Design a protein around this ligand. Sequence first.
Ligand code: MG
Ligand code: MG
Ligand code: MG
Ligand code: MG
Ligand code: MG
Ligand code: MG
Ligand code: MG
Ligand code: MG
Ligand code: MG
Ligand code: MG
Ligand code: MG
Ligand code: MG
Ligand code: MG
Ligand code: MG
Ligand code: MG
Ligand code: MG
Ligand code: MG
Ligand code: MG
Ligand code: MG
Ligand code: MG
Ligand code: MG
Ligand code: MG
Ligand code: MG
Ligand code: MG
Ligand code: MG
Ligand code: MG
Ligand code: MG
Ligand code: MG
Ligand code: MG
Ligand code: ZN
Lengths: 116, 53, 144, 49, 111, 154, 101
Amino acid sequence: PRVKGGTVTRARRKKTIKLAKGYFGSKHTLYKVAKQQVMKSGQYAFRDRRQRKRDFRKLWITRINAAARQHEMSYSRLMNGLKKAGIDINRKMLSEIAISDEKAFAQLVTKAKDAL
Amino acid sequence: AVPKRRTSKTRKNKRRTHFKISVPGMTECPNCGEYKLSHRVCKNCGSYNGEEV
Amino acid sequence: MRQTFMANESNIERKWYVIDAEGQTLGRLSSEVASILRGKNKVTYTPHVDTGDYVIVINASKIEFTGNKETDKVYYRHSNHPGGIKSITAGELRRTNPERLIENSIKGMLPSTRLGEKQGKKLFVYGGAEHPHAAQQPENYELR
Amino acid sequence: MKLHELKPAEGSRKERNRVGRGVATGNGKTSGRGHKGQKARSGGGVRPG
Amino acid sequence: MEAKAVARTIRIAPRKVRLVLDLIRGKNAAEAIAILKLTNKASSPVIEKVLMSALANAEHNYDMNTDELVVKEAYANEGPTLKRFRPRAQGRASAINKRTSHITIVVSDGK
Amino acid sequence: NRSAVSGGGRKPWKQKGTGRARQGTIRAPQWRGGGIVFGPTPRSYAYKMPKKMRRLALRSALSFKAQENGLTVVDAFNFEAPKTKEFKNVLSTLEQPKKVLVVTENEDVNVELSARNIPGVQVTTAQGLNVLDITNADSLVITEAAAKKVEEVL
Amino acid sequence: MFAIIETGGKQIKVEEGQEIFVEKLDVNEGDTFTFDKVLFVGGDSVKVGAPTVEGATVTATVNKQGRGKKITVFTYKRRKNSKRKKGHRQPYTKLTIDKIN
RNA sequence: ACCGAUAGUGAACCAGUACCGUGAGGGAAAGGUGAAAAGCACCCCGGAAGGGGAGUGAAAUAGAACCUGAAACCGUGUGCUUACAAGUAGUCAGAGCCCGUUAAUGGGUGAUGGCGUGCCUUUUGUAGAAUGAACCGGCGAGUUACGAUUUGAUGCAAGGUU
RNA sequence: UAACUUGGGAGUCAGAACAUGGGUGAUAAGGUCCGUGUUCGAAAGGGAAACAGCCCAGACCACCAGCUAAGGUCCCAAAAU
RNA sequence: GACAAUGGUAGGAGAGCGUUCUAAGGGCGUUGAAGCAUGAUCGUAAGGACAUGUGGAGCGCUUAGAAGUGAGAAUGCCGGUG
Ligand SMILES: [Mg+2]
Ligand SMILES: [Mg+2]
Ligand SMILES: [Mg+2]
Ligand SMILES: [Mg+2]
Ligand SMILES: [Mg+2]
Ligand SMILES: [Mg+2]
Ligand SMILES: [Mg+2]
Ligand SMILES: [Mg+2]
Ligand SMILES: [Mg+2]
Ligand SMILES: [Mg+2]
Ligand SMILES: [Mg+2]
Ligand SMILES: [Mg+2]
Ligand SMILES: [Mg+2]
Ligand SMILES: [Mg+2]
Ligand SMILES: [Mg+2]
Ligand SMILES: [Mg+2]
Ligand SMILES: [Mg+2]
Ligand SMILES: [Mg+2]
Ligand SMILES: [Mg+2]
Ligand SMILES: [Mg+2]
Ligand SMILES: [Mg+2]
Ligand SMILES: [Mg+2]
Ligand SMILES: [Mg+2]
Ligand SMILES: [Mg+2]
Ligand SMILES: [Mg+2]
Ligand SMILES: [Mg+2]
Ligand SMILES: [Mg+2]
Ligand SMILES: [Mg+2]
Ligand SMILES: [Mg+2]
Ligand SMILES: [Zn+2]
């Protein structure tokens, strides 16, 4: 028995075209261009999920450094001081405290300074 | 000689920005009230400068 | 859980500072100003917004160099015309256009992005000790 | 047994392999023949011995 | 209330027709008629007939007042192309497209 | 295939110089209206199995009927003339299911004629028994003589 | 008053009456969960743990045990006819903080 | 357990025709209103074409290559956005604005920041300025027969099998 | 923690750099030919601005958690003015 | 429960998805089949539903069987349109 191409070809390509909605020009229209872009989008997303973790860690440190400098301490010493104190608040939580509650951050700084 | 790459719809349409025709320089004819080209005889009533042409 | 604060124009507050360039090395002053302009000294620092403060530099004419930079440090500019290379020494630039010397030094320490260009526009440099931004009520800043 | 509940003996039947039907199968494109040479050609290869 | 007329398979290329349609879109019918009369393009007389037919169907079919009518919609859709060939040098033939337009005019009383 | 399709003897255009893909005939597979590569070709699907397995298969199908209580033994079927209604009535009295395989020792014309038009009912001889017919049927109605004959054969 | 609590290999800054999303916990919906490890206590009274504040706990009520939005994980190596497509939905527990300490 | 209009005859149709060649010869494309023709009386714009009503019909968005009607491609309108900016066009982060769903720790858009030189082939190595593809659609490549061998399955077994 | 034997199925027989022992060339070559090791090939991630072959290290998937390697910590650009 | 493995080209091995047809069973459909279109749905992947619009008469599901069974690339063929 003969099997004609049928509807499977259209159904599959349409899914790819829908995945490339919002892309520029032909990239949101034609199957070949969108497929390539959707492939690139996957590879990028995979890479960027890992990169996101590196970026947010970087931001938290930057904000902590600024907060520490206001208390006349370097980030490097503050974190070394916190470790000696035995304080295990992570950089994200430290950054949030520095922004939200200055008085609480000041207390943590004193603990770090005392440990040194 | 020949296009290295095809022109996208975007590029083509940007080029066509100034590809347009203006409205005719027309004013209402005083005698009949139909629009006529300025400095031309009114086609409807065949009058120019308040005189039949 | 995602809990990181994000600064936005609604919550951002930009201050005005005056820094005296008298008796300061160009680069060391420059690097410090660049951080202030980019909001690096703020706990609310956010990369995709401008959290930095406006900086006024005065007495740019009195900025200092080390070694033989005055004669041996040369700025090169091209006009995009063949053989269109033009050079003036750092010392001559200090004499003629001290504000440019400071401005170019700091801008070279700022990112080449739309945001970075915007942050550079917040810098105001003056060769003399007098500035015209009294209305901004700027605060003196001492370099660390 | 029933004509609506037929089952072959376990291990009795295996599905044939089909080459040149995409990358994921592991037999797509070159179809297990590797790259170039007499052996990769249609009707290609040397006589036994 | 809206009244419409369509001229199908007009043997003029849509691109050419669309230039004139751009002039009259969103204008009062009386002004549109004047523009069409005094504009020197091939599409203008055909478009005028579509507009006149649309205004006629407003007055007759829907008893709208012609003077208050506005050209709400004016557009040209592509019709089927007449495929032709032109003999070129060295025995080669280059294709010629004789394109057609479907011209639609909608007139509205604004109510 | 490419040889069987009409025409296509000559080379469509010269090997080189035209800027076109090289082509050897208009009836090549990738051409519209070209020959098919490796399509269906006439062949038999029939194969054989050893006789002992054929016998085992029949006994296995018949035994499944007995285990499922699909075996009904009747003394004889008496039909002077073919009447479908009478046969239908007999099946109802026998309380037989919709799908029934009726077995006779030898060909009986009246029984075959009587049950021919009734959907779900199949009539076979004892020698005619085949696994497909037995497996398909919900129940089997066998004459005493047929049942004895089957026992001797298998 | 805020508290710093440790769950799912991460630390979360929490306040009373706040919904949180954490790595899946072994609890049914509508159950009460106590976060044993409190690193820091904020508010007017500040307490610093080294590494944990002793006797400090946060009580939360489980609202939902769910799976996150599907992540399509796709990678490829150009010209190698090699690619992999996998779907992922990360399990999570949604809770609401009832009381701190 | 053959095809179903690019399939199946080259030819479902006025096809060995049209068309091409001096000739031998080569050789297409092209099926579908509706149940019924009930195939749009009449009115209106227009020279006509074409259209708007009215009417027929279950349906005319079934009105003549008249079932369905994808995509490329071409328009019209609209929510968000864009004229100091260096772009494999995404991806990750993210205000503002506009919406509201298979109700889901929603949808559209996107100021601005980080990261990022298509795909295939062939290669020691290709962003490659090596190859290939204008785009979209359809079509397009390990098959079958008979032997051989090996593995799995099954029947029987010093027998097994025609 | 492999190894060997027997049997079914392969692909490969254009290699590259780097380091090091040598021939050749000129103690030329991103040269060429043999020995040895590694990487690439067939390997993404971090460093060397960019940069198959160098240095660090081998990506099952998810996380806005932590510690380190090479390499770094004035600004670009995370961390010592 | 514990802990071990899970980069990969040629290539070997395994398990599957989906297409058309057949058998048997069990179903759906003018109170609307297939196809088509749209959606914020589900599964580890191939892929599977559901709703609505369009459409107007066929078509799923289960188990097994059989193949003209899957296209993005061949200066591929034909058609349409840039
Ligand atoms: Mg078929
Ligand atoms: Mg196909
Ligand atoms: Mg990390
Ligand atoms: Mg298989
Ligand atoms: Mg392989
Ligand atoms: Mg391929
Ligand atoms: Mg090849
Ligand atoms: Mg080779
Ligand atoms: Mg080979
Ligand atoms: Mg000629
Ligand atoms: Mg060409
Ligand atoms: Mg054929
Ligand atoms: Mg068929
Ligand atoms: Mg068709
Ligand atoms: Mg045909
Ligand atoms: Mg034909
Ligand atoms: Mg602007
Ligand atoms: Mg971006
Ligand atoms: Mg290779
Ligand atoms: Mg180029
Ligand atoms: Mg070549
Ligand atoms: Mg090309
Ligand atoms: Mg070597
Ligand atoms: Mg820094
Ligand atoms: Mg691994
Ligand atoms: Mg693997
Ligand atoms: Mg295999
Ligand atoms: Mg096929
Ligand atoms: Mg194609
Ligand atoms: Zn007049």
